[PDB]
Scaffold this active site. Structure first.
Site, PDB file in Angstrom:
ATOM      1  N   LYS A  33       0.776  -1.221   0.000  1.00 44.98           N
ATOM      2  CA  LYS A  33       0.000   0.000   0.000  1.00 44.98           C
ATOM      3  C   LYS A  33       0.817   1.287   0.000  1.00 44.98           C
ATOM      4  CE  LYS A  33      -1.149   0.251   4.921  1.00 44.98           C
ATOM      5  NZ  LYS A  33      -0.284   1.476   5.099  1.00 44.98           N
ATOM      6  N   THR A  34       2.012   1.311   0.589  1.00 41.40           N
ATOM      7  CA  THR A  34       2.796   2.538   0.546  1.00 41.40           C
ATOM      8  C   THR A  34       3.327   2.776  -0.877  1.00 41.40           C
ATOM      9  OG1 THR A  34       3.441   2.320   2.904  1.00 41.40           O
ATOM     10  CG2 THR A  34       4.794   3.792   1.470  1.00 41.40           C
ATOM     11  N   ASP A 214      -3.757   7.638   4.496  1.00 47.20           N
ATOM     12  CA  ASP A 214      -3.466   6.209   4.804  1.00 47.20           C
ATOM     13  C   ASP A 214      -4.131   5.716   6.073  1.00 47.20           C
ATOM     14  OD1 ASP A 214      -2.101   3.701   4.401  1.00 47.20           O
ATOM     15  OD2 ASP A 214      -0.181   4.566   4.884  1.00 47.20           O
ATOM     16  N   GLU A 215      -4.097   4.399   6.320  1.00 48.21           N
ATOM     17  CA  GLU A 215      -4.573   3.779   7.563  1.00 48.21           C
ATOM     18  C   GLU A 215      -5.972   4.292   7.910  1.00 48.21           C
ATOM     19  OE1 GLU A 215      -2.997   1.175   8.462  1.00 48.21           O
ATOM     20  OE2 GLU A 215      -0.920   1.554   8.001  1.00 48.21           O
ATOM     21  N   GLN A 245      -8.347  -4.698   9.741  1.00 48.26           N
ATOM     22  CA  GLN A 245      -7.265  -4.409  10.667  1.00 48.26           C
ATOM     23  C   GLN A 245      -7.533  -3.228  11.582  1.00 48.26           C
ATOM     24  OE1 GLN A 245      -3.145  -5.346   9.492  1.00 48.26           O
ATOM     25  NE2 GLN A 245      -3.866  -5.175   7.362  1.00 48.26           N
ATOM     26  N   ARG A 591       1.196 -11.048  10.545  1.00 49.96           N
ATOM     27  CA  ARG A 591       2.590 -10.580  10.759  1.00 49.96           C
ATOM     28  C   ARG A 591       3.565 -11.676  10.271  1.00 49.96           C
ATOM     29  NH1 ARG A 591       1.481  -6.307   9.885  1.00 49.96           N
ATOM     30  NH2 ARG A 591      -0.546  -7.298   9.473  1.00 49.96           N
TER      31      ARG A 591
END
Length: 633
Positions: A33-34, A214-215, A245, A591
């Site tokens: 995503k970044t 973002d987020e 998330q 993770r």
């Protein structure tokens, strides 16, 4: 365009090269995503010919903004005059700087962080002539922040809330007088600027026609409002997020903000990034199935072109000491085969779980570091309890005296303590001995003398009342009688309950330790050691953290411990908190790069006492075909 798209997969390209429109990029774990945000901003400038001046990119953290700046600059150079990239708070500050008079702030107005907020409140409680013991500055700070997080201003005028409201009113007046702005105030004032100054709002809506956030799943109400107001119906917004998330509900995050965007932005289509570059297909299959058990979700299915992967290991420990030993032994095997300790993470729901793991690690001479937190014996609540016990052991423990003479707050002030310290230096006495003498001599102000006499009485009474108690019972007694337990309890909310969880664990710790010169001294020596803790020497070390602190990290080996009903999902969730606990589990599962291991214990010692738990529901929600139990053979 060729260099802009070269490194992208099909869905990433769809987002980066999309027409200017309102877009949700529902970015799966590990899906790049970044890269999408960075290349989308480069595209806007290069292909769409948008000015850098037209781009506002809003990130979750200061480090995320630093990464965004650095990666944009790799593609297009760091000379991006005009482009705003920053956190909600940083960009609110930047706006308020540019329009300070219109926000009724003075030219060099200042920001108050938590530590400076507390310091101001300490001074305010004093200047109102309130009893600090009854009206502790930290509780004022908790109260005020609680109000501002709800968007509430101080109101009017037996109520305890009435006194706190008065403190809140005095705080706000003090801030407005002197041009101090706390973190909650930033966004509130920035939002008010746009609501109140049409010609300012129109400027920024005409300037920032390209907004990226973002987020987005962890945005709160005020953040959502601020973005929506800026965009009005002309700005083209890309939000990037994963509703599966969202784990910061207790901090005010709104998992529904992603769906609210789709509802509020007519353009708004959704582009899913489901292709994952982190985890094996076995791990992904287990993630995918796990999260299906939630209802309030857009839905997706993560997939990878990477390894099929080993099974997820599952171990049933007889108890928490069995569990810690197992995890440690599994990492030993990994390290012995050439793996780095830092490629191993141990994740737990509640930070009080770390203690038995730390002890097991120390016992194995295996370096570790806590990520996003302190080692158990360095946690403030623990240091504070241990200092009561240290004074019981020896009144001449000046460091322990300094730590707790005014914790919880007793209104023993800095000038009074300055006298005690000078006296102890001049007379070559301990702080305690100097107190004794000054009190006998009537050397202190009456108000200083009274609280100090009570403090010394409380310490002496603790030592006498607990003298024949078992270590853990004395410890519980000290936590209660010192007022430590109440100090957290009075500040309702998850943060206070976490501190209480650690206090209760110290009762577990002393019980299990109880190895003798006398139990108390031996324990205090142990605690003082694990010396220890936060080496300035770098070493390769196992990474321990809460599941909340693991957000956005990745490790070849992940161990999630304490998979027990009442531990995780937390008891504090006794359906509407359950989904967030499942999101947290899904963050934990995702993770893991190469191998995931889930463990749980048949019983756990909590607050000194043995408690049975059934395995977490999340274990059985995994596909049978993904999981292999580890058994004696």
């Amino acid at each position: 365009v060729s260099y802009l798209l070269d490194s992208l997969n099909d869905k990433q390209r769809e987002a980066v090269a999309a027409p200017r429109s309102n877009l949700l990029v529902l970015a799966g774990a590990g899906s790049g995503k970044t890269r999408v945000l960075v290349h989308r901003i480069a595209w806007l400038m290069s292909v769409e010919n948008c000015s850098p001046y037209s781009i506002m990119a809003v990130t979750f953290t200061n480090k995320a903004a630093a990464e965004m700046r650095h990666r944009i600059g790799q593609l297009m150079g760091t000379s991006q005059g005009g482009m705003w990239v920053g956190t909600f708070h940083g960009l609110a500050h930047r706006l308020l700087r540019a329009h300070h008079m219109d926000a009724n702030l003075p030219q060099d107005f200042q920001i108050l962080d938590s530590e400076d907020q507390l310091r101001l409140l300490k001074r305010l409680i004093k200047a109102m002539n309130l009893d600090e013991k009854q009206w502790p500055p930290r509780q004022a700070m908790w109260y005020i922040n609680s109000q501002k997080d709800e968007g509430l201003r101080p109101h009017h005028i037996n109520p305890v809330e009435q006194t706190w409201q008065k403190v809140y009113q005095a705080y706000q007046e003090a801030c407005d007088r002197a041009g101090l702005v706390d973190f909650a105030e930033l966004l509130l004032r920035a939002h008010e600027l746009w609501l109140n100054k049409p010609h300012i709002l129109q400027h920024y809506r005409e300037r920032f026609t390209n907004i990226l956030v973002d987020e987005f799943q962890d945005t709160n109400n005020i953040q959502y409002a601020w973005i929506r107001l800026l965009a009005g119906d002309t700005g083209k917004v890309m939000i990037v997020g994963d509703d599966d998330q969202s784990i910061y509900g207790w901090r005010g995050a709104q998992v529904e903000n992603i769906q609210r965007f789709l509802n509020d932005f007519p353009g708004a289509e959704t582009i899913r990034l489901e292709q994952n570059y982190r985890s094996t297909s076995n791990i992904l299959s287990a993630a995918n199935a796990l999260i299906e058990n939630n209802n309030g979700r857009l839905g997706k299915k993560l997939w990878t072109d990477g390894a099929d992967g080993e099974p997820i290991s599952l171990y049933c420990a007889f108890n928490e000491l069995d569990e810690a030993r197992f995890v440690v032994n599994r990492i030993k095997t990994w390290q012995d085969n050439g793996g780095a300790l830092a490629e191993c993470a141990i994740l737990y729901r509640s930070n009080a779980q770390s203690r038995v793991l730390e002890e097991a690690l120390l016992q194995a001479s295996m370096p570790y570091r806590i990520y996003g937190g302190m080692r158990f014996f360095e946690r403030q609540e623990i240091k504070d309890a241990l200092s009561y016990l240290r004074l019981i052991a020896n009144r001449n423990d000046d460091a322990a005296f300094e730590r707790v003479v005014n914790t919880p707050t007793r209104g023993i002030g800095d000038r009074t303590l300055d006298v005690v310290r000078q006296t102890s230096r001049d007379r070559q006495l301990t702080l305690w001995q100097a107190c004794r003498e000054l009190l006998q001599e009537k050397a202190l102000a009456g108000r200083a003398a009274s609280a100090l006499q009570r403090f010394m009485e409380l310490i002496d009474a603790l030592a006498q009342e607990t003298a024949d108690m078992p270590l853990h019972v004395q410890t519980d007694r000290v936590i209660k009688d010192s007022g430590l337990r109440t100090m957290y309890e009075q500040e309702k909310g998850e943060k206070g309950q976490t501190r209480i969880e650690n206090l209760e664990e110290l009762v577990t710790a002393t019980r299990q330790f109880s190895e003798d010169l006398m139990p108390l001294q031996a324990f205090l020596s142990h605690a003082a050691l694990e010396g220890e803790g936060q080496a300035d020497t770098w070493q390769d070390a196992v990474q321990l953290m809460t599941l909340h602190s693991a957000k956005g990290l990745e490790f070849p080996q992940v161990f999630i411990v304490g998979m027990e009903e009442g531990m995780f999902p937390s008891q504090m969730s006794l359906g509407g908190r359950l989904e967030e606990e499942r999101r947290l589990a899904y963050v934990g599962v995702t993770r893991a790069m190469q191998k995931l291991t889930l463990t749980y214990a048949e019983t756990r010692r909590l607050y000194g006492k043995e408690v049975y738990h059934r395995p977490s529901r999340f274990i059985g929600e995994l596909p049978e075909e993904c999981v292999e139990e580890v058994r004696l053979r």
